[PDB]
Paper text:
To meet this need, we propose a new class of antifungals targeting sterylglucosidase (SGL), an enzyme present in fungi but not in human cells. SGL participates in the metabolism of sterylglucosides (SGs), of which ergosterol 3β-d-glucoside (ErgGlc) is the major species in fungi. ErgGlc synthesis involves a sterol glucosyltransferase that adds a single glucose moiety to the 3β-hydroxy group of ergosterol, whereas SGL hydrolyzes ErgGlc to glucose and ergosterol. Here, we developed Af [name] as a therapeutic target.
Full-length [name] SglA was produced in Escherichia coli and purified using affinity and gel filtration chromatographies. Moreover, the full-length protein yielded crystals that diffracted to a 3.8-Å resolution. Molecular replacement with the Cn Sgl1 model was used for solving the SglA structure. The general architecture of SglA was similar to that of Sgl1, with two domains, comprising a catalytic domain with a central TIM (triose-phosphate isomerase) barrel and a C-terminal β-sandwich domain. SglA also contains a large catalytic domain that forms a cap-like region above the TIM barrel, creating an enclosed Y-shaped cavity, which differentiates Af SglA and Cn Sgl1 from the bacterial and human homologs that display glucosylceramidase activity. The surrounding active-site residues in the glucose binding site are present in the same position as Sgl1 and contain the same capping residues, including a bulky Trp residue that creates a wall to sterically hinder substrates with more than one sugar from binding. Interestingly, there are slight differences in the composition of active site residues in the sterol binding site, where there is an exchange in positions between methionine and leucine on opposite sides of the pocket. However, in SglA, there are minor structural differences with Cn Sgl1 that leave a wider opening to the pocket. The position of this modeled loop does not block the active site, leaving the active site solvent exposed in SglA. To aid future medicinal chemistry optimization, we used in silico analysis to dock hit B and hit C into the SglA active-site pocket, since our efforts to cocrystallize SglA with both hit compounds have so far been unsuccessful.
Author numbering: 4 to 570, 627 to 669, 675 to 734
């Protein structure tokens, strides 16, 4: 077997600790292959019916060629991106065995390169019909509300629908989490017995139907891995929960106003009631909000007029498509929350301001921690046991909601010694402003958890203080992980920077200085966070300068078909994310890092009795003729191991037991 969990560390068969420097592969699994429907093409979007993700990311011939890149860049892990839509697209229980068979073929090509792969059931604002990716289309018809009218009802601002796809608002897809469809789907997914207790399919609640199929669609895809025989523990080490779990409306103390914890707006900003009227064809005046130095920004209101057409399936449209039972309680043509007594369609006025406020069964007041410790963990325990009904030795990458307190599983029955805490972190300023500010940055984590009062005691000035701020944020998350969940490993499964900074300034000049300072600062935070590894958010094989990641106007891929590789076109800040890093360490890593300015790699460890320390050294930064190695104890050699013709320089450092450290200096560049 490739890797085992042994507390806070991953260990190889000979007791050496493994460091997971990985990357997400790939952002192309978010949308189908035949027809190739990215975020900007509009024809054929709505007849999802039959899709064919057979092919995404890439055709199998290019697999061994594409995998070779990730070894050359020093990556040893891959977060394999796949959607629930890729498994159960035709309908409930209709699994794409052709997609399964083709995907099993992908893994061994990657296994030939000695990768570590954990599978990611990715999603963004629920479904691709809802302005993102993830869940299949029939899940929306199960809740029933046909995406045709979504345009100006403004439930999920879809990009495959706007008049001009090139004019899709930047970073507006993430706003859908606070809109009608995504607030409804996640609420029904994690707890339908609670807020919409009339949703009964197959005699069971919508909570049990949406979860039961996602739990089963992954379990059936996992049962093939048991029968494959050559990919369990030999390349596939386990699974992840679900990408960025959202609560929807579970815990909204007042649905008539924007909650103070909702810090993202932009586009139209409907409340739950303003989102309720709009999803029923009425009319609302909504404040519109935006972006630093661009967009609405304390805007001036805008009137939304769907004009008599709802964001719901009509009362008579044919459902009889894929099996089908509904209890007569669940209706069509009317608002779901309206029939449950949340609001009156005849008078257009709320019930009150606290339907989504307290506990379904006992009446305890809801918050985000209450949602994370109950309904999310309720969905997580079943997903954990379902994957272990097939493969009990499966490592489960537990991903709680983004930038929220992880569940308190330390000392409970869920203190799983084969679990991994997956944490997301994005520089909220640079990601949303698309500009690396070299002058200030905010301790976002410190503000969210209440370390300081308001974002005024927290902000730090100076690029050095900014670097230390990000590292102490990621370091704090590791201490929060070890406090609530126990002695378990942590993997920063998503972290990156937007490459389209300063109005495509790097694409116009080749000056990637902003992206270099952003990537080096983000990696500097990871290297000092005392974490167990990371996967940079997103390697796209079809990323270009025009469409970015070909998904929601984002441009986060480190690889581009229009940029040059490392030996007026730049290198896409490649010199910033091709870093020396530990691969496998003879003992516990005390501290390591890469100073990109001085081109100096240093690592301090606590040696164990014999078993080597294997470190990746980039060819660009560390040429063999000019690389200078210095050790505090022991001996070292430098080789060029070959893994299917793929070449990368590696240094092995044999040291005795005790406190030792190394300093590797390369070539400085401007």
């Amino acid at each position: 077997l490739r890797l085992r969990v042994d507390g806070q560390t991953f260990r190889d068969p000979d007791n050496r600790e493994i460091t997971l420097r990985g990357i997400n592969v790939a952002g192309e699994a978010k949308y189908p292959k035949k027809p190739d429907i990215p975020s900007y093409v509009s024809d054929g979007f709505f007849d999802a019916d039959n899709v064919s993700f057979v092919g995404r990311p890439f055709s199998l011939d290019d697999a061994h060629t594409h995998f070779s890149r990730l070894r050359k860049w020093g990556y040893n892990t891959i977060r394999y991106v796949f959607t629930w839509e890729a498994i159960e697209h035709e309908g409930p229980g209709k699994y794409d065995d052709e997609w399964i068979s083709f995907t099993i073929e992908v893994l061994r090509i990657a296994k030939q390169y000695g990768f570590y792969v954990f599978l990611d059931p990715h999603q963004d604002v629920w479904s691709r019909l809802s302005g993102g990716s993830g869940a299949p289309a029939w899940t929306l018809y199960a809740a029933g509300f046909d995406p045709r009218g979504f345009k100006k009802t403004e439930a999920a601002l879809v990009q495959n629908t706007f008049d001009d796809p090139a004019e899709f608002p930047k970073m507006i897809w993430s706003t859908n989490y606070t809109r009608l469809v995504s607030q409804t789907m996640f609420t029904l997914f994690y707890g339908g017995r609670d807020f919409a207790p009339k949703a009964i399919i197959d005699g069971i609640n919508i909570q049990d139907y949406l979860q039961g199929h996602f739990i089963a669609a992954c379990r059936y895809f996992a049962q093939k891995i048991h029968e494959a025989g050559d990919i369990e523990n030999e390349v596939v080490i386990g699974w992840e929960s679900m990408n960025e779990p959202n609560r929807g409306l579970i815990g909204v103390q007042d649905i008539s106003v924007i909650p103070p914890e909702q810090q993202l707006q932009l586009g139209t900003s409907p409340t739950a009631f303003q989102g309720m009227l709009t999803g029923s064809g009425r009319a609302c005046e909504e404040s519109t909000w935006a972006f630093g130095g661009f967009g609405p920004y304390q805007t001036g209101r805008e009137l939304v007029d769907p004009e008599g057409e709802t964001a719901w399936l009509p009362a008579d449209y044919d459902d009889t498509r894929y099996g089908w039972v509904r209890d007569p309680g669940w209706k069509l043509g009317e608002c779901l929350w309206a029939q449950h007594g949340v609001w009156d369609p005849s008078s257009d006025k709320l019930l009150r301001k606290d339907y989504f406020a307290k506990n379904p069964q006992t009446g305890e007041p809801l918050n985000y921690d209450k949602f994370t410790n109950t309904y999310f963990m309720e969905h997580y325990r079943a997903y954990r046991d379902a994957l272990r009904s097939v493969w009990p030795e499966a490592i489960i990458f537990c991903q709680p909601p983004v930038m929220e307190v992880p569940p308190d599983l330390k000392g409970t029955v869920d203190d799983d010694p084969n679990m991994v805490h997956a944490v997301h972190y994005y520089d909220g300023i640079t990601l949303l402003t698309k500009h690396w500010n070299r002058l200030y940055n905010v301790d976002v984590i410190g503000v969210l958890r209440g370390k300081y009062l308001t974002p005024a005691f927290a902000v730090k000035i100076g690029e050095t203080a900014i670097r230390n701020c990000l590292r102490d944020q990621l370091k704090f998350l590791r201490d929060e992980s070890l406090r609530y969940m126990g002695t378990h490993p942590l993997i920063f499964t998503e972290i990156g920077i937007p490459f389209d900074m300063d109005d495509r300034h790097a694409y116009k000049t080749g000056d990637y200085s902003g992206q270099v300072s952003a990537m080096d600062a983000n990696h500097f935070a990871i290297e000092g966070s005392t974490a167990n590894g990371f996967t940079l958010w997103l390697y796209t094989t079809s990323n270009n300068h025009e469409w970015g990641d070909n998904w929601n106007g984002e441009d986060l891929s480190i690889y581009s078909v229009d940029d040059l590789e490392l030996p007026k076109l730049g290198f896409r800040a490649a010199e910033a994310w091709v870093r020396p890093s530990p691969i496998i360490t003879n003992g516990q890593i005390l501290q390591y890092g890469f100073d990109l300015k001085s081109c100096v790699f240093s690592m301090r460890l606590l040696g164990e009795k014999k078993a080597a320390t294997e470190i990746f050294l980039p060819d660009f930064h560390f040429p063999d003729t000019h690389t200078v190695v210095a050790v505090s104890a022991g001996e070292w050699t430098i080789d060029y191991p070959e893994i299917h013709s793929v070449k990368f320089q590696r240094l092995r450092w044999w040291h005795p037991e005790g406190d030792h450290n190394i300093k590797i200096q390369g070539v400085k560049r401007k």
